[PDB]
Write a protein that holds these residues in place. Sequence first.
Motif, PDB file in Angstrom:
ATOM      1  N   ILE A 178      27.039  29.030  21.798  1.00  0.00           N
ATOM      2  CA  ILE A 178      27.619  30.300  21.404  1.00  0.00           C
ATOM      3  C   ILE A 178      28.464  30.126  20.158  1.00  0.00           C
ATOM      4  O   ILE A 178      28.320  30.875  19.187  1.00  0.00           O
ATOM      5  N   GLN A 179      29.339  29.126  20.143  1.00  0.00           N
ATOM      6  CA  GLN A 179      30.116  28.983  18.921  1.00  0.00           C
ATOM      7  C   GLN A 179      29.256  28.585  17.737  1.00  0.00           C
ATOM      8  O   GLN A 179      29.622  28.827  16.587  1.00  0.00           O
ATOM      9  N   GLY A 180      28.145  27.914  17.987  1.00  0.00           N
ATOM     10  CA  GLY A 180      27.321  27.486  16.881  1.00  0.00           C
ATOM     11  C   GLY A 180      26.339  28.505  16.349  1.00  0.00           C
ATOM     12  O   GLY A 180      25.803  28.298  15.257  1.00  0.00           O
ATOM     13  N   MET A 181      26.065  29.586  17.079  1.00  0.00           N
ATOM     14  CA  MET A 181      25.036  30.499  16.602  1.00  0.00           C
ATOM     15  C   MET A 181      25.514  31.646  15.721  1.00  0.00           C
ATOM     16  O   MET A 181      24.672  32.437  15.285  1.00  0.00           O
ATOM     17  N   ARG A 182      26.807  31.786  15.453  1.00  0.00           N
ATOM     18  CA  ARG A 182      27.249  32.948  14.691  1.00  0.00           C
ATOM     19  C   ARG A 182      26.531  32.980  13.341  1.00  0.00           C
ATOM     20  O   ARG A 182      26.160  31.944  12.787  1.00  0.00           O
ATOM     21  N   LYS A 183      26.345  34.188  12.814  1.00  0.00           N
ATOM     22  CA  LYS A 183      25.656  34.408  11.542  1.00  0.00           C
ATOM     23  C   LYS A 183      26.319  33.665  10.391  1.00  0.00           C
ATOM     24  O   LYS A 183      25.656  33.321   9.409  1.00  0.00           O
ATOM     25  N   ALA A 193      17.311  23.072  12.567  1.00  0.00           N
ATOM     26  CA  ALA A 193      17.363  22.078  13.631  1.00  0.00           C
ATOM     27  C   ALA A 193      17.832  22.698  14.936  1.00  0.00           C
ATOM     28  O   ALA A 193      17.422  22.257  16.012  1.00  0.00           O
ATOM     29  N   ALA A 194      18.730  23.679  14.867  1.00  0.00           N
ATOM     30  CA  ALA A 194      19.185  24.336  16.085  1.00  0.00           C
ATOM     31  C   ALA A 194      18.062  25.152  16.706  1.00  0.00           C
ATOM     32  O   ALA A 194      17.900  25.177  17.934  1.00  0.00           O
ATOM     33  N   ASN A 196      14.775  24.589  16.295  1.00  0.00           N
ATOM     34  CA  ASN A 196      13.882  23.558  16.793  1.00  0.00           C
ATOM     35  C   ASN A 196      14.426  22.914  18.063  1.00  0.00           C
ATOM     36  O   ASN A 196      13.657  22.504  18.942  1.00  0.00           O
ATOM     37  N   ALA A 197      15.751  22.889  18.212  1.00  0.00           N
ATOM     38  CA  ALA A 197      16.349  22.344  19.421  1.00  0.00           C
ATOM     39  C   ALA A 197      16.040  23.293  20.550  1.00  0.00           C
ATOM     40  O   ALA A 197      15.638  22.882  21.649  1.00  0.00           O
ATOM     41  N   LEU A 198      16.212  24.584  20.271  1.00  0.00           N
ATOM     42  CA  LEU A 198      15.853  25.599  21.238  1.00  0.00           C
ATOM     43  C   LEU A 198      14.427  25.383  21.669  1.00  0.00           C
ATOM     44  O   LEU A 198      14.107  25.373  22.862  1.00  0.00           O
ATOM     45  N   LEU A 199      13.573  25.134  20.689  1.00  0.00           N
ATOM     46  CA  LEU A 199      12.166  24.905  20.935  1.00  0.00           C
ATOM     47  C   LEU A 199      11.958  23.749  21.907  1.00  0.00           C
ATOM     48  O   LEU A 199      11.153  23.848  22.840  1.00  0.00           O
ATOM     49  N   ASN A 200      12.718  22.660  21.734  1.00  0.00           N
ATOM     50  CA  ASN A 200      12.546  21.491  22.593  1.00  0.00           C
ATOM     51  C   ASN A 200      13.091  21.715  23.981  1.00  0.00           C
ATOM     52  O   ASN A 200      12.658  21.058  24.933  1.00  0.00           O
ATOM     53  N   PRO A 229      16.454  34.218   3.203  1.00  0.00           N
ATOM     54  CA  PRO A 229      15.320  33.687   2.414  1.00  0.00           C
ATOM     55  C   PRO A 229      14.641  32.386   2.872  1.00  0.00           C
ATOM     56  O   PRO A 229      13.445  32.235   2.596  1.00  0.00           O
ATOM     57  N   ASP A 230      15.319  31.434   3.528  1.00  0.00           N
ATOM     58  CA  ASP A 230      14.648  30.164   3.825  1.00  0.00           C
ATOM     59  C   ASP A 230      13.592  30.316   4.914  1.00  0.00           C
ATOM     60  O   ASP A 230      13.883  30.704   6.050  1.00  0.00           O
ATOM     61  N   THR A 231      12.364  29.970   4.529  1.00  0.00           N
ATOM     62  CA  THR A 231      11.175  30.063   5.372  1.00  0.00           C
ATOM     63  C   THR A 231      11.257  29.232   6.654  1.00  0.00           C
ATOM     64  O   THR A 231      10.913  29.707   7.741  1.00  0.00           O
ATOM     65  N   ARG A 232      11.703  27.981   6.536  1.00  0.00           N
ATOM     66  CA  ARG A 232      11.712  27.035   7.654  1.00  0.00           C
ATOM     67  C   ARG A 232      12.404  27.533   8.925  1.00  0.00           C
ATOM     68  O   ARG A 232      11.830  27.444  10.025  1.00  0.00           O
ATOM     69  N   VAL A 233      13.591  28.129   8.802  1.00  0.00           N
ATOM     70  CA  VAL A 233      14.274  28.603  10.004  1.00  0.00           C
ATOM     71  C   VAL A 233      13.478  29.739  10.629  1.00  0.00           C
ATOM     72  O   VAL A 233      13.335  29.825  11.858  1.00  0.00           O
TER      73      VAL A 233
END
Lengths: 873, 74
Positions: A178-183, A193-194, A196-200, A229-233
């Motif tokens: 929760i503390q890490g997901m703020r906009k 990476a976060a 992708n972590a969700l993904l794992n 704009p960044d595609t990867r996330v």
Amino acid sequence: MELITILEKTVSPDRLELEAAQKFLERAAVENLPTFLVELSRVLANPGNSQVARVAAGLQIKNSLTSKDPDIKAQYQQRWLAIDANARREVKNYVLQTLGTETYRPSSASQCVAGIACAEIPVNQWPELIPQLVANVTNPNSTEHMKESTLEAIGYICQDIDPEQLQDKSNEILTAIIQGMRKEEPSNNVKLAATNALLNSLEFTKANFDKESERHFIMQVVCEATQCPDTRVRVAALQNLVKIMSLYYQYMETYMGPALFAITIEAMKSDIDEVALQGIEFWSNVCDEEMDLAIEASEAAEQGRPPEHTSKFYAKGALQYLVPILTQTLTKQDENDDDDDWNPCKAAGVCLMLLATCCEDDIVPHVLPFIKEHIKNPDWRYRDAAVMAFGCILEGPEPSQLKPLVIQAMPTLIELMKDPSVVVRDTAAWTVGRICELLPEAAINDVYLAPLLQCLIEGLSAEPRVASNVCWAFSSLAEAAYEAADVADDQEEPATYCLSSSFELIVQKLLETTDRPDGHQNNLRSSAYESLMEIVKNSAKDCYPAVQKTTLVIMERLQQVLQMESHIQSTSDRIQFNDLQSLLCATLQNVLRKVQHQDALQISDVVMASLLRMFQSTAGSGGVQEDALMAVSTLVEVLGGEFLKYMEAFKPFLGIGLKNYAEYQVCLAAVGLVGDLCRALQSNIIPFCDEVMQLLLENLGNENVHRSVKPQILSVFGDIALAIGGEFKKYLEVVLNTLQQASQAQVDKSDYDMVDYLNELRESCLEAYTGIVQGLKGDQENVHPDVMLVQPRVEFILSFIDHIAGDEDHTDGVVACAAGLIGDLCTAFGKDVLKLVEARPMIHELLTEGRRSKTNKAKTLATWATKELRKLK
Amino acid sequence: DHPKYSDMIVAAIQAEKNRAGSSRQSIQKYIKSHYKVGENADSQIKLSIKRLVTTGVLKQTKGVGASGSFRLAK
């Protein structure tokens, strides 16, 4: 000093300094390296080391903690728990510094941590840190990178963890989350990476996600995420969407109109590639997912069932806008077409067919006019869009609209499939098969089968690009010609069909046609090379003039092939070449029904000479491991596998091939080879047996040797028996041992895994005894040699054998061994006859049965056993 | 000693089990999951699968060839 230096020194020109290193590491593995890790952890922690020495350090440490061998990874985990916590945990301590202080393409500590965690989380050896990690990420003061490589590490951990483990600290993790997901978080690497972590971690989330509120709050943060704009996330997010879509399927109504629809329409307008790649593969997933809505509602209203989740029919309001753009979108073709690339297009096509099934009648009005407009478009990239779009809707919409068009279309189609524009005839033909494929208007042609085939003969000689939709159009044509001869009643598959008059030309045009250089276009090669085993399958050689000469031609094609494959330096090229071989191990199958008893055998011998010099070059690389052997288990049956000329070459390479320890399954094959050998070692086999003696002693002595290969050991001596076999029947008892161990094998058939092959071995020793008794019949060799010096054990040898014989009714294979036992068992000796003899039931069930008429030889054998039975009383 | 890879394949398919989803990709990375075999695992195993399909061990569902999703025969 430190190993990291050592990694650099493992590549240092100093011989001894490298050997000593490769020395403490193989000892330390055994030694278990109690401090080694701590020291490595401190240097790795130190950001003052080059990325190379440190990534290498991670590979060594990694190779000391995790592994591509499941077991070795679990042992490195046990080796870890074996290591002292002060030093181990201490290593972990210095390991934390490294996060952020280095760049590693692959995080190895992560994969080790998760792997061992899978061992310590279960016992909670070190699950305490997680909450600390949560505080570490819910309060950030660490530089960007420190937290970044750390989040990438957590991703790998969530990946490599035993799914049943990071639950204990899931709550704390969710706090951290929760503390890490703020906009507000800035770095796209850490964010990605976060995700992708969700993904794992998506495997076992269920309780946290069983609350509509949290998933939706997430959806909320993800929406704040959709404009960056960044595609990867984004990609990592659409991927998450796909899995969240598959398991716990939830409504996107909230974001489809607000964000999914507007974004999509402009992206469609967006000429840029962003739309083309990142947003289309996921798009194909959503469109079919939505199809699930138009069919779930158009059946829920048809089932009087209210769905827990409700559709919205955005598609009905969007079919019309959608039909014209995708169809116009089919124009950016690629002249030279190799079918191995993945692009928005394929995803769109699947959705088109899949969705199309779901699609309502609005698309047809939207596709028919489009069909008319481009079915003859002068272009090639354009002309295809009309016909293609039509062929994709032949099954998706209901038949009311589809069946009439095909009806009036069919008269036009025959002329069309003969239109000067070759493309019209190519796409036309494939499409027609696509029609009878998707609608049932027509099944046979009488005044066109020959004319069409007259056109097809001429079609045989064009460019690949024109030919790929033709191989299948032909397949469907074979489907059709089967319904012009079948009628209502029919005999065995008919020997003669009218083309056989011109068929010979067909068969003589295929080899050249199939071997053209411009193969990269439209994925032509595969579609031809497959239909072949079918057309060969779908061909008759009863007359067989062509199978012969043509066969030698086939060799010539083979020879032609076996020269680029004699030097295949590319895995894809070699793999590609085994395609045709595979197809050959089916065309030969489609010719082999007739041996022909003359030419076929001679041809095989010539070919064999061809098959073997390469075998004389197949050694040491694993080449031709089984493609030719399959054939071999069928060539021996042609002439009884005498092999009078052959096996001369067989003696050294297999003699070293029986010496090669590595072969296991390889040798397995040589066993069915040896199975076919039982009819060919007719003479002079005695000397090269002392060889067999060491090899046989080594494999047989070792228990490892397959249990099945007990009968084959002796069953392939009969061919040697014709000349140059000289051992007597002292091996009879050991066969009385095998049928004694299959009973001994307590094979609990609780599951369907042991049985699927099981009643095969019985047929082995059966063929063994059958051949023994047939060629020679004897009760025992020197009575029993073991009784001479296994007597005290021979008591039990007869008491547990008496228990082996306890069963009143037995399987036929066991019974066959038993009958022989009845004879030589009364010929062996009279010791303990009364007690062992009075051992089991069904005696009167058997005596009565014996007096019954038509009993065989076995019943008679039992009565004799009564002579020796009248040797004690 | 090399363990029987095909048995692993069956275990992995069962492990990566779903009655809806069948796509080979999932099973394939599942093999990528857990541990890893020799670099040529993909080619040799994949050929094993392909050949057992040819024997009719398993029945096609989606796609064509090793690019698809597939189900057992009856």
